[model samples]
Target: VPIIDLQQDHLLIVQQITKACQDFGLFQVINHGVPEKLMVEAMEVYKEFFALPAEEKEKFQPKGEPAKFELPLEQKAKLYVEGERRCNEEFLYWKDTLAHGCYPLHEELLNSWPEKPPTYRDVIAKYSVEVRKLTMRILDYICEGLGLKLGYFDNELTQIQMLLANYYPSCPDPSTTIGSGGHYDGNLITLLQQDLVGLQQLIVKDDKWIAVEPIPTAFVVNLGLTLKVMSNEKFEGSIHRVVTHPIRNRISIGTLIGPDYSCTIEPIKELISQENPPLYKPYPYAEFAEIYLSDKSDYDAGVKPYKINQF
Candidate 1:
């Protein structure tokens, strides 16, 4: 994986990011503005929350209420819930997940967050603010590299933000179970912080998988399906998954930034031309998400259905 330093010269940083996005679809960054202490604290609180008893964690599980706290015990192979079990038992992901909204930060939103760890809300709030800022900074550089004006992605293009915390406990037979199945993120982009070395990215060119080794105080940035369409295929949404360890547990926090459901996303006009035509048709993000959530078996098929040439 490409490792870029955020403290480098402005133009150099932009160049590196552009190349990384085009070739690897993902990269890692160091010296980002987020504070080390805050990151550590955020991780500590999540670890504490995941360590709670099953009954204690069940208190936060989603009910029928709107934007209710989510703490799903098991991530079924299917992306969304079905009336009856459909996937084989072997396909289930051996992980626990906690997720909640973060953007448009307000008191009510914070109140809905996990309160078991006591410091969960406060630490995560601070961490979210810093990470949001970092994401914006990186987007600005991306705009520069793409020859688009600054603030191109400022408005509805990035109106929604979500934070997901994943806990992978040690498995007795690591070979039989997977931490997370290979899939593409449906959002605009995702910033991931991992506590161990289990994240793996599928190399499209070679048809093989490679572990994304953890780098202390660094973050892994990956393009999402939304970005690939917006960039007119200049960038890719990489396929990635996690594996379980026999004795060690793994924790990762992923901050997903994306457009609102009502927004229509397509190839940017500036990126299209006679030689480079729009590869995807315009569609509301909600429709795209519907397709994504309806199936999780073929990661590439989620986006393939949107290609303009597809019949």
Candidate 2:
């Protein structure tokens, strides 16, 4: 039960923080400054939506469009255009959020939520707001851990985006077809909360497949491929996969925070003063995500990045 309370007017030593961030790309954080009640409501709202009839849910079938993922530019030309099947079964988790005027529009995505559940949007929006704020504070904590100015990572531009991927994989043997094949998350950070089993991982140590036990009130956090490239490799992001849990339906809400690819991810100056020099090269978030989508041969126009200017 590691409660990472980032706003207590204190900070941990760089060595300790860096050490923790390194070995375990995933950590169970408690007292993360997010309100418990809000989390409860958000989950309730999600349940309501998922319980909808199959046809009602299909209204938002992502238009079968794809976005940027990790793939070689050369092969991108025909990935999805020629009609290749998407390996992982996907479901919609679109949001209703905006940048500054969050208070008023925070519930927009929730508005997209069905009223049938009655009060469902209110609950989900409450959760989104809290999670969104918590996300910024997370950036601050990371900046502090990196020996940079507290606000070093905050900016009004295209700094963050949240995603909630719903997986409804019909794997006869969830393990056989690969609930989710091994690969690094493509965003800066990913926060996960699941209520079922089968989302195992090939954990860091010994590369063993570690099955994550569902904790009642905790969300698992994992830094992704974006951070791996941004911190000049000081931070680590590794490959992870998800297989169906033993005997339960799989449902997980994964919210990712990220900065636009143009954001500079060069090596931190103070990070190299003494011990470790540098382990990874600096690059853009787009580079990693582009290839990731590519690996699965994703080439849907909807999958193409909406260039930051769209924001």
Candidate 3:
């Protein structure tokens, strides 16, 4: 809703961010310190791969050993839709993605890096490092906004990182189909860089969805379900979707951060109250993914399992 200046507007920006998180749960950030060249190059690498013949583009797909993988847009869309046997193909989305597990790659699977574009691995690696730093700072501000100390989230939550470079190809039938469906991010927060428009943020009023205006050199920030639960529902993690364009392809790189697998996630004691009680129960962070992976394609299915007093 607001374009935040990373450097300027100290307390004011923090307050604005708090309101956006509490109400809209989405916002645009400016002067965020991610390199301009790196952003352009990152988009180019994914675009280039998508442009290549389907035969040549199949290597990046996630199969066995490679940390970098491809997930066809249609296949991923199925997980976001609801159905027992199937959903209408008319509701199917369009897009292809290159997913890289960044944190473990350089450490555990250096060889998994893609060699094409020659600079793909190097540029994205650099970009991930920078985005991680910015994410920490934003997390700190989020904590402060909720009356917690700086590093409360950083120290308590484990940093699990995944970089997703999304490619939404030009569609002949963009009007009937959408890009991504309404869903809450499973991570604590996601830092995204979009080269073109197509992102929509859902507000609480009548479940309205509005387009997020693109700001150059700005990263679109989306608060996640983890923060909403950890904050005892004090912060909002809104639902969002993407709409595709008929003429132009849209590219966005999202960095997802979650807690350590072994950590337990629940409402912080500090945020609990008689009037505002704990709404969720503690569970191992890995359970989030387990529930997500086992879902029958229900929207926000993973978070529903953690709701308190539901039994």
Candidate 4:
């Protein structure tokens, strides 16, 4: 249980933030300021919402063809090829709560989610609002560590992605069946919370998945490619994954904190001038994300040789 206390000495807090980013590229933090009760209630609703019958859940599913769960069986097989799915673990989830207003990514962005137990929407909202706040505070720490403006990222990074997932029946063969494939976060930062402890991470040295121990009331947070570019690659964006839960069905919620697509994701001026030189090529986040989602098969973080833009 690693506790990342935000209220400690400001200078020391910043130093630790950068070190975690550079080395482990991931860590779990507790006492991040979200009320314990908020997360508890959020989980309560999350469980209740998914427990509803399939017919009821179907109504709230995404409307666009671009959505993830539009066709669970067909798509899951297309991607996994592992023959029958081992679990009901989120073949796909309803995306873009634009109507629900969970995210104001666009003036026209919808944020509402589907109806489940009457209290589902209310509880999840409370949880996301609290989680979003904690993520911002962490962003401040990241800024301080870099000797940059405390809120430089908040105002500039406009694009935000948030994901809510439900993991039902896990696989009997935890090693063979993959909960999620290998990849770095497409968003700037991801704040994840799961009730189960089977989530694992791939170590860079051995190129194998290592189990991530759960920290009570703590968030397993990680950085994304955008931050790597902004910090001149001083910070890292690591690969991560999840395995099927061993016991009771698992439910997890992830809020992706990021900058707007129109916004530039490049090395900040203050970070590079005399002492520091730019580390990576200049590529727009919109381009990076669009390409990643289009075809995940070739999405290998280890692939090198950067490209500018094709279109």
Candidate 5:
């Protein structure tokens, strides 16, 4: 995987990010302005929350839909069985996830955030603010790289931002099941902070899986399906997955940035041309998300419906 230093010369950073997006669809960034101390604190607080008993953790459950806790074991088992049947696979991922919206951060949302850890909201709020700024800065560089005017993604195209924390416990038989199934992110982009070395990206050229080794105090930036469509396929949304270790647990926090449900997304007109025509049809992100959630077996099932030349 490409490791990029954000403090490098501006033009050079843009060039490196562009290349990384085109080739690996992901890259690690260091010195990206998010404080290292805050990153470590965020991880620690989340770990503490995840360690709480089921009853304790359920206290923050949302009445509406902006936040969600881990699925019940029964529900998870049913989903796992269905996944195996649909994908014709025997293994189910051994992981727990906690997710909630973070953008447009307000008092109500912050109030709903976990409070048991005493500083969960404070640390995460500060961390989210920094990550949000970093993501927008990166998007600006992406726009420059793609020859689009700056602030191209400044609209509702990225109005929705969600934070997902994944916890993968040590598995008894790591080989029989994985930590996370291989798939492409359906958002515009994701900024991930992990505490272990289990993430892997599949290299299309070599048809091989390569580990994305963890680098302390760095963030992993990966392109998502939305960006691929917007760039008219110039950038890739590569497939990645997580593997488990025998005795070590893994925790990763991913901030997913994407369009709101009501927003329509398509290839940028400036990026479309005779030789490089639009490959995807314009569609509401809500519809895209519906398809993505309806089927998890196929990585492209959601985007496939929007492809221009589908027969």
Candidate 6:
């Protein structure tokens, strides 16, 4: 529920980010360096592209391969979960998602981008670079909050970057179904841009869920599992999901930055000491996805099992 203004006092901004990480694990940032015009342009292009004829839009469909090619996961990665079981079987979400890779850009991948929009690839590519810079800046704040060196993340983790574009259509029965059921992100952190309001995150207080209203020229930042584990519970990873708007369709683009598939993620040695023992065990970054993609039980299942035993 914190709204941070990046244009304000520098030390205050850092303090605000630190507090949000400790209390909410999420915050809305306004006056963030990205230009307002760029966000509007991206939104317009996404809406237009999604409005294209089914046959035409299908050409941009992602190949089933991971990151090697840029294409939509289409419906393959969609999930609706309640605890460990999939709920909402009676009614599915009225939504479509495109999980596309943006970083470490390749010509082959760029070729697959929707040619119709013409400006889609170029605009998003530029926006992606801007977002990357913001993420790095935020990381520096997070590092300071966690008492780590400024460049700890850059030195310790091999990074992976991708953009997740979510399109939710107006639903006749928005009451019965969800756009995305409550779940945590698979990445370390995600920077989200949405055209309209419909994002909600679970706040542990009395086990309630809260809605994050849309703010113009602002990005909603949320922490994910890798950050939660790395911070050793000093900073939390909030669980969140999207709900359907009864009348208006909504679009949100998420820039996901994560540890590379080959990188190992665990609590840093300095963060662990006699007073605060290591909470989680080490695992290859890919293992989480391996379990997540294969085991239905593992999706958004909290990081408890990774905790070291007291023996």
Query: How badly does each model clash, as a count of residue pairs?
Result: 0, 23, 1, 18, 0, 2
Measured by TM-score, how close is model 2 to the native structure?
0.69
Off by over 4 Å in 5: 60-94, 309-311
Q: Give lDDT tens digits, candidate 6, residues 1-311.
A: 89998999888988999999999889999998998899888888788877878676556443522232122222132221121212333444445665566666778666656676788878888888888889888989888887888988775352666677777766655454466766677678899997677898888865888889888579999998888888887887878877777688888888888877767888888888888888889977666656544444543454555778445
Residue pairs clashing, model 6 = 62-71, 62-72
What is the descending lDDT order?
Answer: 5, 1, 6, 3, 4, 2
Please report, in order, the local distance difference test score of every candidate based on alpha carbons.
0.79, 0.53, 0.71, 0.61, 0.80, 0.73
* TM-score, prediction 1: 0.89
Model 2 weakest 10-residue run by lDDT: 74-83
Candidate 6 off by > 4 Å:
62-93, 155-158, 294-302, 309-311
RMSD (Cα, Å) for all candidates, in order, is 4.7, 8.4, 4.9, 5.9, 5.0, 4.5
In model 1, what lDDT does residue 92 have?
A: 40
Score candidate 3 by TM-score against the native: 0.85
Query: How does model 3 fare in lDDT?
Result: 0.71
lDDT tens digits by residue: candidate 1, 167-276: 77666554445567788888898999986888999999999999898975899999999999999888888789887766778889898899888799899998799888
Best of the two (2, 6) by TM-score: 6
* Pairs of colliding residues, candidate 3: 61-70
lDDT of 4 by residue, 160-221 (tens): 54554544455454433555656787668888887677677767767777877776577888
Residue pairs clashing, model 1: none
lDDT (C-alpha) at residue 50 in model 1: 78
Give per-residue CA lDDT, model 2, range 2-112, as digits (tens).
Answer: 334343445553344466567656665565667766666666655666676756554443353433232332111111122222332443222211111122343454344
RMSD of 3: 4.9
- Candidate 1 Cα errors over 4 Å, as ranges: 64-93, 309-311
